[PDB]
Every structure is written in C-alpha cells, then in structure tokens.
Amino acid sequence: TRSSVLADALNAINNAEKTGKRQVLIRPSSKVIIKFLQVMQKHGYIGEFEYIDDHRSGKIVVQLNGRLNKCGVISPRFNVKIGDIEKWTANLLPARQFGYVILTTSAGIMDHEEARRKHVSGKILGFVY
C-alpha cells in the first residue's frame, strides 16, 4: 500500500522528465510535497504548479521545463547532524557547485546550503539536481 506519497510524487516527476513531457499529475498532494516543490521551484527546476482541490487529498499538476536531471527521495528520513550534511552531499550530488540536498529541519523544509547559512540540521528528505 502507499507508504510514501512524496516518493510516488518524485517518481512520477522523474518518469515525466525522462519521457520529455512538460507536465505531470501528482496524486495525493501532501504538505511536504508542496514544500518540496516550492524548494525545487525557487532554484528553477520545475516552474509553475497548481493545486487542484478535490475534497479528498488534492492533486497537483506541475509544469516541467527541461532543467531537471533527477529528483529523488531518501527513505528512511535519517537523522542528520551538521558533519553528516557534508558527507551526504558528497555521496549523492553530481558536483560540488550545483544540486541540492533537501532536508526537513526544525526551521522548515530547506536545502542544505540554506541550512548551512542558518546553522540548523534535521532529517533528510531527498535531493534535486
């Protein structure tokens, strides 16, 4: 059964970006999905998305430009301290100049570089480049 709606969302976005499509429908649209998409959107990896309100959970239609190589999830949400962020970024980012590890810290959901600016850590959710 569905354990991770965020993982299903990111897998659907990956299949869409492999096929060359400019849009994808996400179901069922949690809060963490919205915040993850907002992080991807601020860096310019997706574009506009819209939240369809059916009354059950919501759906989302994201618009895709050509810039995304792979958005992924890290399951389980490992507990991450501040040196752990640099080992995680070295393991799963393609270069040291682009790409973001997204992690849910106690001051909201953010990427790893803004977490370094705020000096805060937390649990790891996924990655984007």
């Binding site: 959107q41 601020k42 574009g47 506009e48 998305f49 939240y51 369809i52 309100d53």
Partner: protein, 184 residues
C-alpha cells in the same frame, strides 16, 4: 428600533443600515415578524479600486441562516438605498490559534475554529446565491500564490458585477489574492 439589532456602541454607518432595516420592516408584512430576530454586530467599509466602497455586514453565526433566507431581498433594497456600494453578509467566526509545543493546554480546538476553515467559510459566504464547484491554487515561480474559485453558472447574474469587489474584500480580510472563474 435602530439600536436593538446592533451590538454595544454603534457607529453612524451601522445606525444608517439599521434605519434601512426598520424602514424595510414596516412595509411588506411577509418579512415583518420573519426578520424581527435578524441582527448584526458591525459593518466594515473598505474601498474597491473602482471608487465604489463595499459593505461587509458581520452577522452572528446562528443568525446567518436567517439572513440567508431573505438575503437577496435585503441586499437588493440596501444596495438600492446605498449607492456606490456592493453589500454582503459575512458571519463573524472565531479563530483559535494553533497551540505551540510548550503552550499550556486548553480545550481541544475544534476544526471550525481554525484559520483554514474560517477562511474558506468567508470565501463560501462571499458568493452566497451561487455555489463554489471548484478550487484551484496556482503556485507562481516568483513564490506567491493565487487561489482560483469556480462558480456554477446558476444565479451568476446576481454577483457577476461584484467579483472584483469580492476580490478586494478577501484581500482585506485575509491578505490573500483570489480570482473568480465561471466555467462555461
């Protein structure tokens, strides 16, 4: 006549719409002793971009049904006596704030007292003769949101002229930005 429908110390504006109520009540006895219980708390005037201000008439939540039974008639007569205005009856609903981690316990905060529920209730009661059939929320790339609501095509002649004023009153009450759409 005037002050009984009102609550506490009234303002001239409130008094004026109260006089509109009592000069409605003396005629047409098919609303007399039906709208005798009807009574509002206050009135807020907020300017739309068109020059013409709007009238939000805040009614108590039990009262709301009773207003809705006669609401078209009242908004017609009141807009027909208060020019340069559109007129709506909203219900004053209380928000209790979301309890923090350390904050000391109070009762369970039922779902009607949350900000999302009262905000889509005022969105519901902006447009009363029609029905919301859809709701969209656009997330633009600059970082700001736009909520779109979708109204059914029945009785849209009642509020097709008030829609940009509906937008301005929702922006004043919530800080959000809404757009309206009639699928056709």
């Amino acid at each position: 006549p005037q002050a009984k429908i009102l609550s506490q110390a009234p303002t001239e504006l409130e008094l004026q719409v109260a006089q509109a109520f009592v000069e409605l009540e003396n005629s047409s006895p098919e609303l007399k002793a039906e709208l005798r219980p009807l009574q509002f708390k206050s009135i807020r005037e907020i300017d739309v971009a068109g020059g013409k201000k709007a009238l939000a008439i805040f009614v108590p939540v039990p009262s709301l049904a009773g207003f809705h039974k006669v609401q078209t008639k009242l908004t017609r007569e009141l807009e027909k006596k208060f020019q340069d205005r559109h007129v709506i009856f909203l219900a004053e609903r209380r928000i209790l704030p979301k309890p923090s981690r350390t904050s000391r316990q109070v009762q369970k905060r039922p779902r009607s007292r949350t900000l999302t529920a009262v905000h889509d209730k005022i969105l519901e009661d902006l447009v009363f003769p029609t029905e919301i059939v859809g709701k969209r929320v656009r997330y633009l790339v600059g970082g700001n949101k736009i909520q779109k609501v979708l109204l059914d095509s029945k009785d849209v002649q009642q509020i097709d002229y008030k829609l940009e004023s509906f937008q301005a009153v929702y922006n004043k009450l919530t800080g959000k930005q809404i757009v309206f759409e009639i699928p056709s």
